Design a protein around this ligand. Sequence first.
Ligand SMILES: CCCCCCCCCCO[C@@H]1O[C@@H](CO)[C@@H](O[C@@H]2O[C@@H](CO)[C@@H](O)[C@@H](O)[C@@H]2O)[C@H](O)[C@H]1O
Ligand SMILES: CCCCCCCCCCO[C@@H]1O[C@H](CO)[C@@H](O[C@@H]2O[C@H](CO)[C@H](O)[C@@H](O)[C@@H]2O)[C@H](O)[C@H]1O
Ligand SMILES: CCCCCCCCCCO[C@@H]1O[C@H](CO)[C@@H](O[C@H]2O[C@@H](CO)[C@@H](O)[C@H](O)[C@@H]2O)[C@H](O)[C@H]1O
Ligand SMILES: CCCCCCCCCCO[C@@H]1O[C@H](CO)[C@@H](O[C@H]2O[C@@H](CO)[C@@H](O)[C@H](O)[C@@H]2O)[C@H](O)[C@H]1O
Ligand SMILES: CCCCCCCCCCO[C@@H]1O[C@H](CO)[C@@H](O[C@H]2O[C@@H](CO)[C@@H](O)[C@H](O)[C@@H]2O)[C@H](O)[C@H]1O
Ligand SMILES: CCCCCCCCCCO[C@@H]1O[C@H](CO)[C@H](O[C@@H]2O[C@@H](CO)[C@@H](O)[C@@H](O)[C@@H]2O)[C@H](O)[C@H]1O
Ligand SMILES: CCCCCCCCCCO[C@H]1O[C@@H](CO)[C@@H](O[C@@H]2O[C@@H](CO)[C@@H](O)[C@H](O)[C@@H]2O)[C@H](O)[C@H]1O
Ligand SMILES: [K+]
Ligand SMILES: [K+]
Ligand SMILES: [Mg+2]
Ligand SMILES: [Mg+2]
Ligand SMILES: [Mg+2]
Ligand SMILES: [Mg+2]
Ligand SMILES: [Mg+2]
Ligand SMILES: [Mg+2]
Ligand SMILES: [Mg+2]
Ligand SMILES: [Mg+2]
Ligand SMILES: [Mg+2]
Ligand SMILES: [Mg+2]
Lengths: 740, 740
Amino acid sequence: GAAILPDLGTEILIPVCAVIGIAFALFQWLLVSKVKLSAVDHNVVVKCAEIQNAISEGATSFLFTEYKYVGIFMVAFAILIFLFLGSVEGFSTSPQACSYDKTKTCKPALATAIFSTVSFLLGGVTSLVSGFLGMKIATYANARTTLEARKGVGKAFITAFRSGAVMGFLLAANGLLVLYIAINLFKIYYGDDWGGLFEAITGYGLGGSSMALFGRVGGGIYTKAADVGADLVGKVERNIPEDDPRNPAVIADNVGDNVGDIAGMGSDLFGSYAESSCAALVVASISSFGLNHELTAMLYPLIVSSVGILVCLLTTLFATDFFEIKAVKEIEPALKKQLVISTVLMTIGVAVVSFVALPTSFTIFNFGVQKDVKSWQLFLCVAVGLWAGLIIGFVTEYYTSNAYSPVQDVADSCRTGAATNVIFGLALGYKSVIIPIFAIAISIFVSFTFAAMYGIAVAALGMLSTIATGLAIDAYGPISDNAGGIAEMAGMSHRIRERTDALDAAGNTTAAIGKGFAIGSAALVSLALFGAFVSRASITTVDVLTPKVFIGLIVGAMLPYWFSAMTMKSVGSAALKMVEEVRRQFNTIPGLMEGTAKPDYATCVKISTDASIKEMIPPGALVMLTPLVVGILFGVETLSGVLAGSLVSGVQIAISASNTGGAWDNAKKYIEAGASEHARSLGPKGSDCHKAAVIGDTIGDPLKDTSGPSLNILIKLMAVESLVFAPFFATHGGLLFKIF
Amino acid sequence: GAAILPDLGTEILIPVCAVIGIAFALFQWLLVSKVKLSAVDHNVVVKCAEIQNAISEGATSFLFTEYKYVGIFMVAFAILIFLFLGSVEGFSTSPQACSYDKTKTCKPALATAIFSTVSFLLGGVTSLVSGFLGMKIATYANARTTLEARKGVGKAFITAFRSGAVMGFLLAANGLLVLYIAINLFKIYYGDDWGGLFEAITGYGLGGSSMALFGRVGGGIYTKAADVGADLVGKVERNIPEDDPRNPAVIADNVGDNVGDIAGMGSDLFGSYAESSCAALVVASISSFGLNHELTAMLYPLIVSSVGILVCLLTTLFATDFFEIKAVKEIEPALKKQLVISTVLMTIGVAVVSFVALPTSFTIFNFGVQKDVKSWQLFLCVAVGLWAGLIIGFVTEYYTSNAYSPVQDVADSCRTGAATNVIFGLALGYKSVIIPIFAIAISIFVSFTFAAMYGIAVAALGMLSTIATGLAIDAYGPISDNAGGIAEMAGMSHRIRERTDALDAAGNTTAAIGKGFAIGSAALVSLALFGAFVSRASITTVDVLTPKVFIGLIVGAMLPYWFSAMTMKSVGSAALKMVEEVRRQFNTIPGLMEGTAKPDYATCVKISTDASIKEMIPPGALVMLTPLVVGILFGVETLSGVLAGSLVSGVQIAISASNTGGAWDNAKKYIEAGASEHARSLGPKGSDCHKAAVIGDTIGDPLKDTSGPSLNILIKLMAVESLVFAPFFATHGGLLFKIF
Ligand SMILES: CCCCCCCCCCO[C@@H]1O[C@@H](CO)[C@@H](O[C@@H]2O[C@@H](CO)[C@@H](O)[C@@H](O)[C@@H]2O)[C@H](O)[C@H]1O
Ligand SMILES: CCCCCCCCCCO[C@@H]1O[C@H](CO)[C@@H](O[C@@H]2O[C@H](CO)[C@H](O)[C@@H](O)[C@@H]2O)[C@H](O)[C@H]1O
Ligand SMILES: CCCCCCCCCCO[C@@H]1O[C@H](CO)[C@@H](O[C@H]2O[C@@H](CO)[C@@H](O)[C@H](O)[C@@H]2O)[C@H](O)[C@H]1O
Ligand SMILES: CCCCCCCCCCO[C@@H]1O[C@H](CO)[C@@H](O[C@H]2O[C@@H](CO)[C@@H](O)[C@H](O)[C@@H]2O)[C@H](O)[C@H]1O
Ligand SMILES: CCCCCCCCCCO[C@@H]1O[C@H](CO)[C@@H](O[C@H]2O[C@@H](CO)[C@@H](O)[C@H](O)[C@@H]2O)[C@H](O)[C@H]1O
Ligand SMILES: CCCCCCCCCCO[C@@H]1O[C@H](CO)[C@H](O[C@@H]2O[C@@H](CO)[C@@H](O)[C@@H](O)[C@@H]2O)[C@H](O)[C@H]1O
Ligand SMILES: CCCCCCCCCCO[C@H]1O[C@@H](CO)[C@@H](O[C@@H]2O[C@@H](CO)[C@@H](O)[C@H](O)[C@@H]2O)[C@H](O)[C@H]1O
Ligand SMILES: [K+]
Ligand SMILES: [K+]
Ligand SMILES: [Mg+2]
Ligand SMILES: [Mg+2]
Ligand SMILES: [Mg+2]
Ligand SMILES: [Mg+2]
Ligand SMILES: [Mg+2]
Ligand SMILES: [Mg+2]
Ligand SMILES: [Mg+2]
Ligand SMILES: [Mg+2]
Ligand SMILES: [Mg+2]
Ligand SMILES: [Mg+2]
């Protein structure tokens, strides 16, 4: 009937867990504030701090500019939501029959047009705040982990990891607390209409990912224009070290890590968290939980996320307190232990939550029919996504860490030049999709079979249930990356850079793992939302063999390529400009190459700024307008096909791009470290094998930091966007077919 | 109702047009034989003959080796077809009610098993003959083109182009004649059972493309191992000309153009032709034409291809006798006009065919129901295919020719090194898919809407109705390529090479165009075959939102990545071996770098022979086993998703890979030619820009010549295979769902 945990217990447990997470983030920041520096050894400390500030200012300054354009576009788009959703019942103010049950009376559509607009703006704001907080902690932790590197890898690891945990706990706890509050606020207006309530709440996911789209693309173009320009002139052309202060692009580069890899990705992951919770809420709201107004069972997804914060806090302790890194080969294994521990504990967590927060039987909406489901089946839906995630992590590690043969062979292929390096790296990323796809399909089959779109949605959330940790291991990498850049720029000892290099290479693997979790969960939520879209738009069958569905399927499968085209070329063009800028400085400013004059950092910052702010617009436009263009002109059947093809096609290029790029970076890192004889035989730095590895690395740079990771957003965003506009498309869409 | 053209009329016309095409081919071969050479200056002549022989022997010898393996694979698979099909009705010899008309009696399913094996074997034999005859004309024409280049570019054009026409007309005529014969012979047995007759005839395409898959993959690995090795060591490492006779890999490189770009391609296109005709014939056989035994209308696709041959003969005369080339900038436009003229004349021919060979009204089988279709709508189905082809040609030219800005900016990006060449070449490929996809989507919509799977099929066929000319402009390219390999190897003057380079650049564009036609028609026929499969397998609805279909969709979308991983890895590995060997000869054979010692060519030929014969197998296994493993294990609904997914997904990567490869080749060719201030400034040969262009080109080599082009075969071959095995999967498959 109803569950062991009462509605009130749930109303308390969720925000408590949120505050536990925020508290624990604040505590970790406090620990990290113990490492001291300012700009007012000791000369070294002053240099770190001066470098931290330059970076800190650059990141702040670009986010402010980027957030200004995105906030304006957000406001415009919120108006389209209001207008389009408001037009379904001609802006009437009267109630009408429930979309989900014509025998009942529901709040007016116009109202849901307003609360959708509201949840949208909430999600956009929470997304910018996610990116921004992430950027604040990263640009605060970077120099601190550099200084801690003076004491050994282990101490630097620890401060990079605590700081990632600050980012992970703040975003997980925050995205959860804001949703919970918005649900409770909305419920005041909605009453017994839970359908209209969680329909309205859907705009939150749409707000998260809409903003994430620009954050990832804008940041991604800023950082990679710099990265490529810096590394090419400096390492390939001039034979100076990576991240050398004579290099005019290096500040842009390191600012880059913070505005892309940190702020773009914090947004992106908030988008994933939000869409997944929303997808689950929407199907539950017209299932037994929502129809019977059972609030615990209804908020099962938030209860899972709540218990996930607890599990991740416990998990974090293993890497920060219970264990110490003494040898570099211990870094990658430690990060991985974080995944294994959280997954195991979280399986326990989800079982307890399922025992306590669900009745043993209930029904789940299934394309018009109430399907009988058991709490043990729903446990299995969350679990399969949770384990699918771990699988994806293990395979990604295998294909991107330089501790294994796929990356070692890519490095090796450098002996025959850049061409063979690239060909091997491309083959590696292609090859890498196989198992993650099987994992995704298995977890689709199981969750779909057990609980239809609800099953699939909470399998997406299961995959993201350990997101505080996931964000911790990922945020850890750009912090480490900056740390080594500050070392080189501070003039510090050769062996400080060796330590940070080793943290950094582990970070490379870890970034590829986050992209995997983001692609796996995007595939799952997007499928759940596609199905919810189909119901909400009153389509009886999405029949692949009809002209409308098929042209949607093939065109939708083209979109990820069109998107990749724009974003690769933006980076290509901007990087070309950056190389010319860097060259100009080295060739023209007397004493630059000799270390006696200062480079002009601001000109490189500007090339990145201009290119990104300008070139983020078409890809953003492509993704946000496609559902509106196709929904209005062609209709819901054709958009159905678009969503299916973009999902299935988009994930392939997304996985292969990220793993290719990750593999070229770590192959280059392998040569740079010379930690085995095979690795030493490709060296030293500046060797022909090394330069071939650098060429691969910088082709990989836009693949994995601009186009690849954003593709997961192209897919999940079109999908929520379609669902939110479903009533409008069902009613007023399909124009070309109405006319002729 | 009868057409204006009687049945007997049709029976005469088709073989007559076949013969006319064979005669035209022979006449052209004869004209080309007027160019004299023998191995028994006049020193240039002797030398060209010797080299011509070394290529010819290497090409004959590789194909005999490949074709042996492939022929053994073919007999084995033929047994499998017989057993699997024969097992559906437990090998019974009794007649059964016709599934298309329960009042009639039809031939035993065992008969259809037997005849499917027979058509398969014809198709395989014809595909190997197609490739072999292609290689024989190319390895005859190549040196004759070198010699004619002594008189000028236009003379060398005429010889290469007459020689492509040899291949085009032989392949188109012979494929048409064999189909026509097989239909008449099977009819002797089937009599009035046209359903059985044409169900059995479908083996022909399956044998066509099974043989092609190995030919393309085998030939492709062979050629690119050689090419990457020769080019990287000779041009990038040792600063010697391309095709320098000092390079041990150059014989293997030039044999490679004949064994991949010619023999692999010829078989590939033959399978396109065979599948498209077969798909139109299966649907018509249970539509009014087949149910009413109306021979002319039944053979409408063959009549279309017969008229296509006449149209192409006419079109060929424009490039062969009526215009002459006197300047390098006229080569590409002459080649473009061949497609414009054939398209414009075939529009008229197809209008005529549609007027005389169809009743004005009839019905087409459509998912169990006879749909009313008029002959003018059928005209449009064929015509949208034809016109979508030309759109694809124009767009592909725009993206791959160095007369235009996309490639010139790709060459331009060399100014900043190999990493920017590759980022730009990658973005260009991705970008290039937009319009071809839109054209394919429009042809699907039009032909689907008018005439279901039949209209789609004859749309595939319409795109291929000008195949004799399509093959001629394509085959023209490798012949031209060899021509310049032979020029350099014969130590001919720089002027001869400049001419061949102009011919060869245009061949690069024309190869990309051919690939665009192969991919276009593959998408179309695969959709037609996918729909026909669904009927044969008794599926009521392929519904995307079912666990079975959806897991097939996403796994299907992954197959083209797994295939690309294997083929790219193979070329990479064989290339790496090739570089090692070339390096060793330059570094240890005293006098080789100075021209006083002969290299060892055979070793390079060996490395590429062993690699290709061994590595062709797994990718061939993956394509041919997937329908069997999926149909038997998961069943016909899952296989449906696999077909839809592989089609929509594989078409994106196939187009981008090919156009990217083509763009890198021509960006390089543009630095090589220095025909304008911008081009000159990237040179000269041996410059860092030039070497960056070479790096991009060699990375493009496996993309465009091994994995990219074979991908159309993956798609179209899984589709005809699933159809042939449909009755078997429908009865004995879905094991995993039966046991649980
Ligand atoms: C619908 C659900 C179906 C359930 C069953 C699916 C699970 C089976 C996985 C098959 O995939 C394989 O995975 C890799 C294993 O990691 C590859 O091996 C490879 O083996 C090595 C051999 O040295 C290396 O070459 C590596 O690249 C690579 O791991 C292998 O090619 C690939 O096909
Ligand atoms: C559905 C698709 C069909 C799947 C069925 C698989 C059939 C297995 C065939 C076994 O024979 C193959 O052939 C070559 C020799 O027999 C081997 O390498 C070869 O080994 C020899 C050299 O010793 C050759 O002469 C070389 O050309 C070549 O590289 C190759 O590894 C081996 O696999
Ligand atoms: C059915 C689905 C339909 C959904 C419709 C979606 C509309 C999305 C608009 C995308 O258009 C892009 O924008 C740039 C125009 O701003 C183009 O030119 C260029 O723009 C330049 C900036 O002026 C440069 O950045 C580039 O080199 C680029 O080539 C680029 O070609 C084009 O693709
Ligand atoms: C050989 C390897 C092929 C691999 C395929 C594996 C699948 C196994 C399917 C076997 O099919 C059955 O075989 C019997 C015959 O062997 C049939 O009996 C039928 O056979 C007839 C005699 O031929 C009659 O006596 C009866 O109608 C009788 O029901 C029966 O219908 C049929 O379904
Ligand atoms: C899906 C249905 C959509 C229908 C759209 C129609 C598709 C056809 C697009 C083909 O692309 C065009 O081709 C021209 C070549 O024919 C180029 O012109 C070029 O023509 C040359 C020579 O005639 C040059 O001199 C010029 O630079 C000139 O830009 C042109 O730029 C290019 O974009
Ligand atoms: C969805 C249904 C699918 C069912 C059909 C699947 C059957 C065909 C897959 C064949 O397996 C492949 O085998 C190769 C070799 O056997 C490769 O591994 C290889 O392993 C080594 C040994 O051969 C080397 O060749 C390596 O370079 C290479 O990675 C390759 O990656 C692997 O995938
Ligand atoms: C309660 C929250 C759960 C979280 C705890 C985690 C452990 C449970 C997962 C294992 O799944 C099992 O559950 C049983 C059920 O408990 C089984 O039989 C079930 O048992 C009966 C009802 O409980 C039957 O009527 C059904 O048909 C059904 O097959 C089912 O086969 C089995 O694989
Ligand atoms: K990183
Ligand atoms: K060519
Ligand atoms: Mg870098
Ligand atoms: Mg970085
Ligand atoms: Mg860095
Ligand atoms: Mg990195
Ligand atoms: Mg980088
Ligand atoms: Mg070459
Ligand atoms: Mg060649
Ligand atoms: Mg050549
Ligand atoms: Mg070429
Ligand atoms: Mg080449």
